[PDB]
Subunit: 107 residues, 3 copies
């Protein structure tokens, strides 16, 4: 989907993870976070629509999303092993990566 | 997945959106609608299994699904910005596209 | 995502299906099962990371996952038609395929 709809989805799902109780609520929201990244991995932010697809500034955005999909995958495995608290702790660091990525291309 | 299982998923998720209360319930169901389209974008309806992959009748089905995935993406962004009512209003028009697509290839 | 995080997701979602009440809870968990398979269809289990990508042992793992994604698709259509009980019955046989696949590459 659109880039900022996925980024707004990621931010809202982090608010569902922090207020979650069991590991099922955390695991499902983390998979919705993975879902939004897969639908928007092909997307392009609004301020980068007039940049070369091989431009390093656009190429910087591509690997930055790989890091985001990678960190989300890590938190899913922690939430899969039943570690509901340590996965929420991984969601704290995940929000740092999400917020830093969203601000760099929000415009 | 199978074409009509996704189309039945889309129809049921629309029934979850109309009876939803907050923006989280609408956003999650809209992502399930996006999920079903991604799993079945490669699929083929039963009545079109004996049509050429480059046939305009089959090619008409392909772009018709792009329109569906496009409208779903629009409603996700409206539900991402917090506009829970205007996104439900986008789900009303979404059901028109879903119903018209499903009837054309239901058989 | 990682192979065993998806396999742990599949196992937990089966526990959500057996204790589910309506067809919406079964259909959503079955789509999360389809979600985990799509994110990890490209993945590789830990004990098979040093095997040729064209090796029959690794190639056996690939088709084994196709069977899993195929059976999940079948149960989704049964849960899409409203058959909440017959889809739960398909989840019983689904757990057999999941457990047999996970044990063969758990290590
Ligand atoms: Ni995909």
């Amino acid at each position: 989907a659109d880039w900022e709809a996925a980024m707004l989805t990621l931010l809202m799902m982090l608010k569902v993870i922090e207020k979650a109780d069991n590991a099922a609520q955390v695991l499902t929201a983390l998979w919705f976070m993975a879902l939004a990244a897969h639908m928007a991995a092909l997307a392009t932010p609004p301020k980068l629509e007039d940049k070369s697809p091989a431009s390093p500034e656009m190429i910087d955005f591509r690997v930055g999303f790989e890091e985001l999909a990678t960190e989300i995958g890590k938190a899913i495995k922690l939430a899969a092993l039943g570690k509901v608290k340590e996965a929420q702790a991984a969601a704290e660091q995940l929000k740092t990566t999400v917020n830093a990525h969203w601000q760099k291309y929000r415009s």
